Amino acid sequence: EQQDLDARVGKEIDAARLRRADNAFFGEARKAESVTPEAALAIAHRWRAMTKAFMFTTLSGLGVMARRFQGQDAPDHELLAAFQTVYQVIGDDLDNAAPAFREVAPRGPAGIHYVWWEDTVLKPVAAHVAEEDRQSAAVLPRAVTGLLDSMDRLATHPLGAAVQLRVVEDIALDIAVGFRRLYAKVEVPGTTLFAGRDDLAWVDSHIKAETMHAAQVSDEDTGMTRLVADREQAEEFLTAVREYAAHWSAALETYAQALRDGHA
Amino acid sequence: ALSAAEQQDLDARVGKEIDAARLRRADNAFFGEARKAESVTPEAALAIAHRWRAMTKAFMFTTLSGLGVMARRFQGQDAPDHELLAAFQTVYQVIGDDLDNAAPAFREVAPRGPAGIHYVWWEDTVLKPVAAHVAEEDRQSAAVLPRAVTGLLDSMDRLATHPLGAAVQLRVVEDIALDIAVGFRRLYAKVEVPTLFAGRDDLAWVDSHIKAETMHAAQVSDEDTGMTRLVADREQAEEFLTAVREYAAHWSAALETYAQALRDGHA
Ligand SMILES: CC[C@H](C)[C@H](N)C(=O)O
Ligand SMILES: [Fe+2]
Ligand SMILES: [Fe+2]
Ligand SMILES: [Fe+2]
Ligand SMILES: [Fe+2]
Ligand SMILES: [Zn+2]
Ligand SMILES: [Zn+2]
Ligand SMILES: [Zn+2]
Ligand SMILES: [Zn+2]
Q1: CA-CA 20 to 30 A from B69: which of A17, A35, A48, B169?
Q2: Which ligand is nearest to the CA of B266?
Q3: Which CATH architecture has domain B4-264?
């Protein structure tokens, strides 16, 4: 049953068209010749919101889990093992404790991943976009805010933090690769963006690290589904993964639209 | 909105509340009774171990819960101030040491996995060794928490859903944690049994905490990234001090039962 719940979680991510071969954003990042700065800035504002919300809502869900263990006289060590994994994995976005992030990430609040992203990706591209097109890039499509509303719900769900890590850290690497590809084809005149040695340290360090995160969230012993105590919780976990993965897919497909449209 | 001259007054008053609650080394009775005691009975040592396991278990989880309420408050904001984000990171690193043992002092000694969680590490290496020397009747009696301790556990449960709860708990506990650790090292070296904790690393939980709780105390009271830096306006400054005063009062009453157990020799 433990093994089956894993496999069925993976199938829900398949059906949501999140895998590397099925998602439009992964394709359009690979196939596009150039990327207008307006489009790249629109994706930067959307990712900034989605990854900020991801970090805080997951930490929130981690606290909801904490509040349940305190209601238990002696929580089972296997549930504590997965609890530790949530803390470690989410923490890297907050404190850069992994090897790939401790190297290059800024110190203090500027190393928080959404702050790091807006400082080294969003703003450098924003310098090449007219203010009128910057306000338009800031407007978040309702598929993005729809995902933000889902994260809000999972922020108070007893299994929410596990639903978010299991799904997100399973699509992280292909997102980081799409950014590596797309933010290098941004066509601005005279200057060439992101040509310097560590101009995209955010993206590169996430490529080196998110391989370790996918293993931890899916590890059969300290993985996220080991937070599922009984069968009724396995039903809920699957149901959350289904709706959550559906929101991520529709959110990422707006990135492909921005690339196709060349604007927000 | 808090001016610079206002931030400094909040830090001073927080220190004075903890002083007023008789929690400093010279004032609290537990710290003094642990030093004065010639010998400690296994019964009293086991009651303190049971109360500490409960108090440190609740502390860690409720503080983690409080870390969650803050995360929800930050998500509601479009751009949380980096000064608040800096103290947030501190909350995350200090309380995380009870869970992942990232600090240098726990780096070498702590067990790996769930058994390294400090309340689990505490009961495995301190509680269970002393429990073997206590009659059945007295183990059930040591596991029954006094009113003052359950009063502290309730105060933790209310702060678990308070938007400043984790900052309140960390500000007080990490400030007094070193003295509690020194009290544990003294009394658990004096348990009289027909000897206990004679191996070089039998009290590694305590010794690693004597080193690490020196840092934590400094981190929570830092002027730029400390706990009062999570207080945004004058109303939250009011709630912080009222919370600190009530919380410190409960901690004082709870440690008083530790001193009482050392004097009585039983639970
Ligand atoms: C949404 C999480 C992603 C994969 C990554 N952790 C980040 O810093 O954004
Ligand atoms: Fe990250
Ligand atoms: Fe990650
Ligand atoms: Fe600890
Ligand atoms: Fe500590
Ligand atoms: Zn929905
Ligand atoms: Zn168009
Ligand atoms: Zn009270
Ligand atoms: Zn007596």
Answers
A1: A48
A2: 9
A3: Up-down Bundle (1.20)
